[PDB]
Design a protein around this ligand. Structure first.
Ligand SMILES: COc1ccc2c(c1)c(CC(=O)NCCCCNS(=O)(=O)c1cccc3c(N(C)C)cccc13)c(C)n2C(=O)c1ccc(Cl)cc1
Ligand SMILES: COc1ccc2c(c1)c(CC(=O)NCCCCNS(=O)(=O)c1cccc3c(N(C)C)cccc13)c(C)n2C(=O)c1ccc(Cl)cc1
Ligand code: HEM
Ligand code: HEM
Ligand SMILES: *[C@@H]1O[C@H](CO)[C@@H](O[C@@H]2O[C@H](CO)[C@@H](O)[C@H](O)[C@H]2NC(C)=O)[C@H](O)[C@H]1NC(C)=O
Ligand SMILES: *[C@@H]1O[C@H](CO)[C@@H](O[C@@H]2O[C@H](CO)[C@@H](O)[C@H](O)[C@H]2NC(C)=O)[C@H](O)[C@H]1NC(C)=O
Ligand SMILES: CCCCCCCCO[C@@H]1O[C@H](CO)[C@@H](O)[C@H](O)[C@H]1O
Ligand SMILES: CCCCCCCCO[C@@H]1O[C@H](CO)[C@@H](O)[C@H](O)[C@H]1O
Ligand SMILES: CCCCCCCCO[C@@H]1O[C@H](CO)[C@@H](O)[C@H](O)[C@H]1O
Ligand SMILES: *[C@@H]1O[C@H](CO)[C@@H](O)[C@H](O)[C@H]1NC(C)=O
Ligand SMILES: *[C@@H]1O[C@H](CO)[C@@H](O)[C@H](O)[C@H]1NC(C)=O
Ligand SMILES: *[C@@H]1O[C@H](CO)[C@@H](O)[C@H](O)[C@H]1NC(C)=O
Ligand SMILES: *[C@@H]1O[C@H](CO)[C@@H](O)[C@H](O)[C@H]1NC(C)=O
Lengths: 552, 552
């Protein structure tokens, strides 16, 4: 029906219907011309000839350890490299944002309505003959069948990069401030109207929730002491709404910024660590500024914790994941002479990509115990039983699962993996290869090239028939990993642009914010710039246990 | 009290208390160093030596007509000049925004809460000894006395630049989509959450209001035909809430996007013109795209009218006000190789500066009638009586008042001018000379330099005593105008940066939006790029009457 149903325009040109059965491609500033924007300009021919592939770049970034060690110790050179990482990535993102689940064309409603997730690729039009457009059968393969044959875990496959449970729960804690799907509206809708790293999962999404969590003395958050240890306050004491099963004793209904963080003790672990960190910074700021009131202490601490988070995410968390020998760097000043939009809108595809449930082990090993999912979920007495110190030590030792490579989703959350398939289709996602072309990646020509093996590929070929109809979400979890890596190419090359845009797009990174007085002076500024996952745990967890994002 | 109360930091450095009675200035990236950021760096000394004053630049832009005529006809050169206008202006604006009425320091609440107007200068802290900080008496002069002695109109002073009533009501109509003070909360709060040119005054601020105004056929807005002429629908037919006195007959309660536009027939005139323009573009787009639905026609029309508005504002409206011989140009492509933030936050000071009530005449002259304020206000039967054609012809002929120069506020709206004084103090505005320094202007050293005359200056000196205590709002309306100009230096140099940021910061000006397919192809794109105030009236007002922003 829709003459744009076949995605005819290439190289990021836009398709517009010019009639019932005709189309036009807008090749403006794509570097290409022609009916579908496939004829390259002369300069585009040069750039294409000289541009290395992501797999070639990945090889260089993870080898030549001696060379990278020299680069890392020459600040001019390390700064120059990190700068090209930041800019060349963010060019892949439309900012200001464009499409969403309901708009395949730009509109003021799509731009201005913050309740939507944005979309990197427009949805497939409702009256297209097939789910992916024109290709494939009239209906996609049964999602339960896709789930069982290539996604569910047989044997636990550990991450060859050594990610531990401190990493897995940090990723879950960190991402759930901007992945907050509004199920009352639909999967393409979010309740995180800040659309980035605003730390609403600590401070609350609304002002009313924030004030219920605050102590209103010295800028601090409310807390309680249990067995000599600082823990978050209760729902009874604060009246903030939290999601808990009906049988949870009210002394165990912990109240934090994010309403679902009582779901898992691993989320509650980091919520306690970051609550402690907020009040620790309040003590630091109060000593520096005896003349300050409660309000300014709270607000300045929040700005500092936002900075710490971005620092830890880039220099520890992304550093770990990447496996690069090059040392990534959080330095907003690198973009001050660059074109860059200090804004962000969370993409649905970013949300989809971040479903890293293969990380989860089959049991959670704390001290000498091994807890099943049923024993673990919604049970914060485990946290009080063992304490934060034992949690950190145990989760630093416990290995997490490999995400790519196939067949590593634990069956305990199989309903979540099926809904990811079902809701991706409900949201009319374009095909895997459409998203690969959208991010300058060469389309896969067979299922065997996608997986790098034969068994899962053949099962996928029987299900999907055509590689161009393969879906984005299952492909990320079955993709051939990089050599001994946690992810395949598609995960890294689609996800890294969304990730750094979210981190660097924050207002505190802009030149009028990135100065010591924003953070209460050089003392507050230095907390941001010296932050690490190790110092986060050391300053706030009794005994200063060693921690890391990888097993040692 | 607050050791920053005296505004000690100069040249846009930030003041932070380091104790009960001591402060520190953050001179980061100001180009200055020293205790109060007054010692210029070497390069800063150069720039200061070579930079012409705004009054010198003004003189050049309004003289040498022969030279400007050559420049205007050399596209490369005209583009280069307009580009430097755009960039050098926007550097004066904090984007992402910083302060607001409740926050004199940067905070996440100030950044993220869209209900606030932002502030170009932080408010004077609550516990400062004087209203302006440390200078002046403990209380500012009686506002009624300031109003009567230097603001109220004796004799009507016409604008020497020839502004007519088409201009005055265009400015009122245009600005009232982003100046919508939320009086339920306070003067530092806004109901225009789009914070710019989103045309909510045509389409409604909320989706629910928009749908009540829409026809849901061919993308069009609801309308009625009275005497063969197209007018907005009624409150009875649409159920959109409008502000009307209780005695207005329901057949005269017109419903438009902005709830207060029934206040004056001049606002209702432009509301009708733009309603007609929306549906006219809907007819154009439907002919180009017979395959399109109602929703896509409406959204694309809205994007086109947003483009037309920015075009008309820059190339007709700002062009008229400026008096330049150089031809200003709306061309988003000029910023594509420039650093620029495609976002905006409406400033409280921009609202204050746009109080152009001296524009209003003592009577409104339509055909042979002269209506008093009492006869004019809330009386749309006047519009139906004469029709749009007679309105345009009459308002093109009627001259408007001079804004600067003093004593030209019509007595009918004296309560509005007093509230501007009162609410400027309630919001703890800094002094006139502080705002001049904030925008790179040399402080006034006497009231006589401010006004350029002797009588009003002497009255102001008896009231304020110290020039450094003179307030921003009254100073704009008494300032010495530029030679035969409508404004003084302060109005232009503070207001032009806010104005162009609002216009160019719009998403439709960003590179991913500024292409023909965003606007339905080259036909919709050309509507934007050929828009003018004359063509707006010609396409939509019977007889295509001549119109202009100046009397002929
Ligand atoms: C690997 O595993 C990973 C895994 C995750 C990763 C990353 C790396 C990265 C680093 C990155 O951005 N990875 C891609 C950029 C590499 C190439 N950058 S380049 O500029 O094009 C370039 C091209 C050519 C030569 C270059 C070069 N030379 C001189 C050889 C040096 C530097 C750059 C060069 C980020 C942010 N992740 C995320 O946070 C992320 C978070 C959530 C999701 Cl779901 C997905 C990702
Ligand atoms: C005048 O009356 C007016 C009155 C209003 C005006 C303007 C001019 C202007 C044009 C502008 O922006 N006026 C200031 C920029 C002039 C200098 N620009 S410059 O780049 O620093 C420069 C510096 C040195 C030499 C230059 C030069 N040469 C080669 C001599 C050419 C071009 C620029 C040069 C804008 C937008 N208004 C507003 O919309 C507006 C709306 C509401 C409010 Cl309440 C207030 C204003
Ligand atoms: C014991 C650990 C975990 C459990 C029990 C769990 C369970 C769930 C459940 C039930 C949902 C559906 C929530 C909803 O749709 O409202 C969900 C969604 C999600 N999961 Fe987890 N998960 C765990 C760990 C993780 C980890 C480690 C990550 C990432 C590193 C992750 C990423 C996500 C994301 C991004 C969503 C989407 C959230 C949203 O869109 O609002 N999960 N998970
Ligand atoms: C007959 C014509 C006019 C009348 C009766 C009028 C009257 C008023 C009144 C009563 C207010 C206070 C509204 C409120 O605070 O809610 C106001 C505010 C304002 N006026 Fe006018 N005015 C007229 C023309 C104009 C013009 C020509 C301009 C500018 C070119 C202008 C600019 C403004 C602005 C910017 C505000 C602030 C609005 C806000 O913050 O919500 N007005 N006017
Ligand atoms: C953002 O878009 C959503 C979806 O259109 C809006 O939610 C709809 O609101 C209307 C009335 O305003 C309701 O009748 C619908 O039931 C809602 N639909 C859905 C799917 O939730 C939402 O109001 C918009 N938000 C803003 C601020 O405009
Ligand atoms: C933006 O700030 C205003 C002002 O603080 C908030 O309005 C207050 O809201 C609280 C409860 O949330 C009320 O008790 C107060 O009466 C309100 N004060 C005023 C002056 O209106 C508003 O909620 C904030 N908006 C958001 C989205 O957080
Ligand atoms: C300057 C020297 C550049 C060397 C280029 C190395 C290109 C490596 O290439 C990659 O090797 C991977 C194995 O590591 C394979 O898995 C990938 O398929 C392949 O593309
Ligand atoms: C939920 C834990 C696994 C459920 C597997 C259901 C069986 C259907 O799946 C089959 O499983 C076999 C064993 O891996 C594979 O060898 C086959 O290729 C696969 O199609
Ligand atoms: C290259 C030629 C430079 C000409 C510089 C002219 C500077 C004019 O200067 C200005 O003149 C105005 C009147 O026109 C006065 O009102 C201003 O106070 C004055 O600064
Ligand atoms: C792309 O253009 C070619 C001609 O250049 C045309 O044959 C083809 O139909 C177009 N796209 C698709 C999807 O068919
Ligand atoms: C909760 O955790 C405790 C250990 O602290 C365990 O003994 C108990 O069985 C758990 N409860 C459930 C319902 O699994
Ligand atoms: C500015 O600094 C000078 C010394 O350089 C100091 O005397 C003065 O007190 C400072 N500012 C004010 C407002 O006093
Ligand atoms: C309204 O306008 C009409 C002219 O159309 C005029 O005769 C009438 O007096 C006005 N009403 C008021 C209350 O001013």
């Amino acid at each position: 029906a829709n003459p744009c149903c076949s995605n005819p325009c290439q190289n990021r040109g836009e398709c517009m219907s010019t009639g019932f059965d005709q189309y036009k491609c807008d090749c403006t500033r794509t570097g290409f011309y022609g009916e579908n924007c496939t004829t390259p300009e002369f300069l585009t021919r040069i750039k294409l000839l000289l541009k290395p592939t992501p797999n070639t770049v990945h090889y260089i970034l993870t080898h030549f350890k001696g060379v990278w060690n020299i680069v890392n110790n020459i600040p001019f050179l390390r700064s120059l490299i990190m700068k090209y990482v930041l800019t060349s990535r963010s060019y892949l993102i439309d900012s200001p944002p464009t499409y969403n689940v309901h708009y395949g064309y730009k509109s003021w409603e799509a731009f201005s309505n913050l309740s939507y997730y944005t979309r990197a690729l427009p949805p497939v039009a409702d009256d297209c003959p097939t789910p992916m457009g024109v290709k494939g059968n009239k209906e996609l393969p049964d999602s339960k069948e896709v789930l069982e044959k290539v996604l569910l875990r047989r044997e636990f496959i550990p991450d060859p990069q050594g990610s531990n449970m401190m990493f897995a729960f940090f990723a879950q804690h960190f991402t759930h401030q901007f992945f907050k799907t509004d199920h009352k509206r639909g999967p393409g809708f979010t309740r995180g109207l800040g659309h980035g790293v605003d730390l609403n999962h600590i401070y609350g999404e609304t002002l009313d929730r924030q004030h219920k969590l605050r102590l209103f003395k010295d800028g601090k958050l409310k807390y309680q002491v249990i067995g000599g240890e600082v823990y978050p306050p209760t729902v009874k004491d604060t009246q903030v709404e939290m999601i808990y099963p009906p049988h949870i004793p009210e002394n165990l209904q912990f109240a934090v910024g994010q309403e679902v963080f009582g779901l898992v003790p691993g989320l509650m672990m980091y919520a306690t660590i970051w609550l402690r960190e907020h009040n620790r910074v309040c003590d630091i700021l109060k000593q520096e500024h005896p003349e300050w009131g409660d309000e300014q202490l709270f607000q300045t601490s929040r700005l500092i914790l936002i900075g710490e988070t971005i620092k830890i995410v880039i220099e520890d968390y992304v550093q770990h994941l990447s496996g690069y020998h090059f040392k990534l760097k959080f330095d907003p000043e690198l973009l001050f002479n660059q074109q860059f939009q200090y804004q962000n809108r969370i993409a649905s595809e970013f949300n989809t990509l971040y479903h890293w449930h293969p990380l989860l082990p089959d049991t959670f090993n704390i001290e000498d115990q091994e807890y099943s999912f049923k024993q673990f979920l919604y049970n914060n007495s485990i946290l009080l039983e063992h304490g934060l110190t034992q949690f950190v030590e145990s989760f630093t030792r416990q290995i997490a699962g490999r995400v790519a490579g196939g067949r590593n989703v634990p069956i305990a959350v199989q309903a979540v993996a099926k809904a990811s398939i079902d809701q991706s289709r409900e949201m009319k996602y374009q095909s895997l290869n459409e998203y690969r072309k959208r991010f300058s990646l060469k389309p896969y020509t067979s299922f065997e090239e996608l997986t790098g093996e034969k068994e899962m590929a053949a099962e996928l070929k029987a299900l999907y028939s055509d590689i161009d109809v393969m879906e984005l979400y299952p492909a990320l979890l079955v993709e051939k990993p990089r050599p001994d890596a946690i992810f395949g190419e598609t995960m890294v090359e689609l996800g890294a642009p969304f990730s750094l845009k979210g981190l660097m797009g924050n207002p505190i990174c802009s030149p009028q914010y990135w100065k010591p007085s924003t953070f209460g002076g050089e003392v507050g500024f230095k907390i941001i710039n010296t932050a690490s996952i190790q110092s986060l745990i050391c300053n706030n967890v009794k005994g200063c246990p060693f921690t890391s994002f990888n097993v040692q």
